[PDB]
């Protein structure tokens, strides 16, 4: 419960997966106002580390570019070098890609990352595990109908994933 603007009580209901993280590149707005990003049938990428000159991981991006589908990126941070080429790429039409910061705190964001990936069918890139920046095929990336992004929030309409994985993630939560 929160304080309302009016003299009247109001209820808000959220469907699907949504989080309180904004978009690093304000410049990429897919269609609507408010800085909204709407990616249709996007591929979702999750990583445990930041991207700077470390842009190399491009074959992952290119595979998506080859596909012709939008890319959603979740990681600790993204720097202007990747964003600079990316903003041009999205504007020029090569790829429609926007990146958003992962949750909040060390354990908190990465614990939270596996469910996002599993929900969308994707695989989290584990720096931690036998995985690397350019080591990961397009198939690794998760899928969703579309996403909605604004300055302070990221939303996924529906990731494509199986019930056994959705429920299993919820089941492991019981401990």
């Amino acid at each position: 419960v929160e304080d309302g603007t009016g003299l009247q009580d109001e209820l808000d209901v959220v469907e699907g997966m949504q989080f309180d993280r904004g978009y690093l590149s304000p410049y990429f707005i897919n269609k609507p106002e408010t800085g909204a990003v709407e990616l249709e049938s996007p591929f979702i990428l999750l990583a445990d580390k930041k991207i700077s000159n470390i842009r190399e991981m491009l074959p992952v991006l290119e595979a998506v570019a080859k596909a012709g589908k939008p890319l959603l990126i979740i990681a600790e941070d993204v720097e202007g070098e990747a964003l600079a080429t990316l903003v041009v790429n999205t504007m020029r039409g090569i790829v429609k890609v926007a990146a958003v910061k992962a949750p909040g705190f060390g354990d908190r964001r990465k614990a939270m990352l596996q469910d996002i990936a599993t929900l969308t069918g994707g695989t989290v890139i584990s720096e931690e595990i036998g995985m690397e920046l350019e080591k990961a095929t397009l198939e690794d990336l998760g899928q969703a109908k579309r996403v909605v992004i604004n300055k302070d929030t990221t939303t996924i309409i529906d990731g494509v994933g199986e019930e056994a994985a959705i429920q299993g993630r919820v089941a492991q939560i019981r401990q």
Binding site: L58, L61, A65, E81, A84, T85, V88, V95
Partner: peptide, 12 residues
Amino acid sequence: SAGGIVLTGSAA
């Protein structure tokens, strides 16, 4: 043409 279909702006 670096990394693939990716177009990269020249920086450093």
